[PDB]
Design a protein around this ligand. Sequence first.
Ligand SMILES: [Cl-]
Ligand SMILES: [Cl-]
Ligand SMILES: [Cl-]
Length: 241
Amino acid sequence: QVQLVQSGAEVKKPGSSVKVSCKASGGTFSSYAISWVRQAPGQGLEWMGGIIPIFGTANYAQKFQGRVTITADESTSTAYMELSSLRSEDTAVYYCAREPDYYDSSGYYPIDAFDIWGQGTTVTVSSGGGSALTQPASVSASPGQSITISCTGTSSDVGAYDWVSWYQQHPGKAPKLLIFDVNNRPSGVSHRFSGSKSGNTASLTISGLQAEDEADYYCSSYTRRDTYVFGTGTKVTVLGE
Ligand SMILES: [Cl-]
Ligand SMILES: [Cl-]
Ligand SMILES: [Cl-]
């Protein structure tokens, strides 16, 4: 029953800092990290960094190295992201998400994906006067057929290992994990969704397309540089619906 709830919206001028919190509750499981992922208005997902609360070791995208700090307080089950020296491009919804280890006969194992997401925190930077993974921008299709969405990366992400995932996002909601480890569906995800990859391109197939599948879809991969990257996003429109 694990869930993540984030703090409320912030409005800031350029040059200021913002600190967003993420409170975990509802479970007992402890083998996980927390990542922070942002999304500018009308745009795609961008990974910022993450932390493993049980050690306190944080990792960042190079882009944000030196002006983002991610911390965690185990006593209150809260993670934090502080972004300093704000600028125009920082206007976005900021999400925290769990990066868990699962457990099976192989023992503990990473899914290399984000299964539980916070609801997002809007940060607006006031006006001051002024991708490794690529996807098709859009696909439109009538319901009741199969469609496929592609994700083209490089040898150091999609083409490296099976650490490829897919997310669905409906308007006003956090992304939802549909596929991890190239072709695995989370418990409860429809088996109409399937994943594959060939060389540097991954594919999500949606069979028996339904009206409710109209959404944005993002591929993601871990990388040889110990980071996550996200695709540019594909808008699926279901025709007549
Ligand atoms: Cl301010
Ligand atoms: Cl949500
Ligand atoms: Cl589903």
